[PDB]
Every structure is written in structure tokens, then in C-alpha cells.
Amino acid sequence: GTNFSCPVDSPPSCDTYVTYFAQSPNFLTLTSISDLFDTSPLSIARASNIKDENQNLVPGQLLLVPVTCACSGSNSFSNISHMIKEGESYYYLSTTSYENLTNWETVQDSNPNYNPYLLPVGIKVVIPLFCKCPSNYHLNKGIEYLITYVWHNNDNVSLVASKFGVSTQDIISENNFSHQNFTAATNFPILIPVTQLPSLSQS
Numbered sequence: 001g002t003n004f005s006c007p008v009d010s011p012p013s014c015d016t017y018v019t020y021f022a023q024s025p026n027f028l029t030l031t032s033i034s035d036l037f038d039t040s041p042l043s044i045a046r047a048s049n050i051k052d053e054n055q056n057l058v059p060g061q062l063l064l065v066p067v068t069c070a071c072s073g074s075n076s077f078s079n080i081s082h083m084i085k086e087g088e089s090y091y092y093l094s095t096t097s098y099e100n101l102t103n104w105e106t107v108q109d110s111n112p113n114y115n116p117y118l119l120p121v122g123i124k125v126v127i128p129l130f131c132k133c134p135s136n137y138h139l140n141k142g143i144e145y146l147i148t149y150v151w152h153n154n155d156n157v158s159l160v161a162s163k164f165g166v167s168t169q170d171i172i173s174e175n176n177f178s179h180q181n182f183t184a185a186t187n188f189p190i191l192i193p194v195t196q197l198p199s200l201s202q203s
């Protein structure tokens with residue numbers, strides 16, 4: 001499907017964004033998400049068109065979190081050093097906290113020396129988010145960012161496309177959605193290509 005391999009021709013590191021949605025158990029503050037992602041709340045608010053940094057986020061509200069993304073071998077990642085809180089697994093952390101922007105596998109692959117369930121509260125575990133950075137061909141098109149977005153079984157391209165202000169075809173071809181198996185109930189990361197940061201709806 002979508003290849004998350006380091007472009008051979010374009011720089012190894014870059015700035016893009018990953019998509020995160022407000023979650024009603026705990027992540028309904030900017031503070032929640034900034035602590036989850038190690039960035040300032042204003043950077044998120046600026047990237048998400050939020051004009052008041054103190055307003056609560058409504059459940060499911062779309063947000064763009066700026067991340068800096070680099071090469072770790074032949075694949076692109078953006079690592080977040082997350083400190084362990086009480087009762088957190090790799091699986092929990094990566095399917096609810098980080099909202100499937102990373103799978104348990106790659107996490108415990110770049111976090112050796114550890115027991116995936118005996119995590120002592122207060123240890124640094126690096127959470128490699130998925131991200132790609134513009135190939136040379138991306139940049140010659142005018143693409144400024146490949147935003148990470150977690151495709152679920154429920155999304156349809158027209159809604160997401162109008163949300164990010166792109167064509168359906170842009171999404172479909174960037175992710176080779178023309179022979180891609182949505183049968184699998186899996187969630188998988190994809191890349192929205194955008195010529196500029198989009199002007200997200202107000203709530």
C-alpha cells in the first residue's frame with residue numbers, strides 16, 4: 001500500500017504533521033496532547049486552526065500535531081520519548097494513547113532491553129510515529145507535506161478529502177488505494193499529500 005520508506009533523493013529529515021483526534025477518556029485538553037507528543041500547545045493550535053488554546057476539545061475533534069520526522073535506516077519515523085505512567089503497556093499506549101499512529105511491533109523493536117508488560121513507571125520508551133517525507137517527485141509537484149492519517153474501515157475518501165482540502169484522487173493514488181484490501185478490519189496509516197497546511201474547520 002503506502003510505502004513509508006526513506007526517499008533516496010530528498011533530505012532525511014523534515015517537518016510534517018500527524019493527525020490526532022480528541023479522545024473522551026483523558027485527551028480533551030491541548031495539554032493532554034502536547035504531553036503525549038512533546039510539543040507546545042500553541043504549535044498544535046496553530047496547526048489545527050484552533051484560535052483559543054484553553055478551550056476544551058470536543059470528542060473526535062480533528063487536530064494536526066507538528067512532528068519532526070527523520071530516517072532510521074530505510075524507513076521514516078518520528079520518535080517521541082514517552083515516560084511511563086501507571087498501568088501502561090506497549091499495546092495500550094499505541095492503540096489508544098497514540099491512536100494507532102504506531103504499532104506494538106515497531107515500538108518494541110526500537111525499545112529493546114525491556115519487558116513489554118513489566119514497564120517500570122518513569123522509564124523512557126521511544127514511540128516511533130509513522131511519517132514520510134516528500135520524495136523529489138512530491139516536491140516537484142508542489143507537495144509541502146505528507147500528513148499521516150490513520151485510515152479506519154469507516155472513513156470514506158470524499159469526507160477526508162474535503163476535510164484536508166484535497167482531491168479524492170490525490171489520496172487514492174498517494175496511497176495506491178486502487179489495489180488495496182480494506183477487507184482486513186485493521187487500521188493502517190496513510191499519507192494525505194498537501195501543498196500547504198490546510199485550514200481546518202472550527203470545531
Ligand SMILES: *[C@@H]1O[C@H](CO)[C@@H](O)[C@H](O)[C@H]1NC(C)=O
Binds near residue numbers: 156157158159
Ligand atoms: C462519503 O462522503 C460524501 C461527501 O459528501 C457523502 O455525501 C457520503 O454520504 C459519504 N458516505 C458514503 C458515500 O458512504
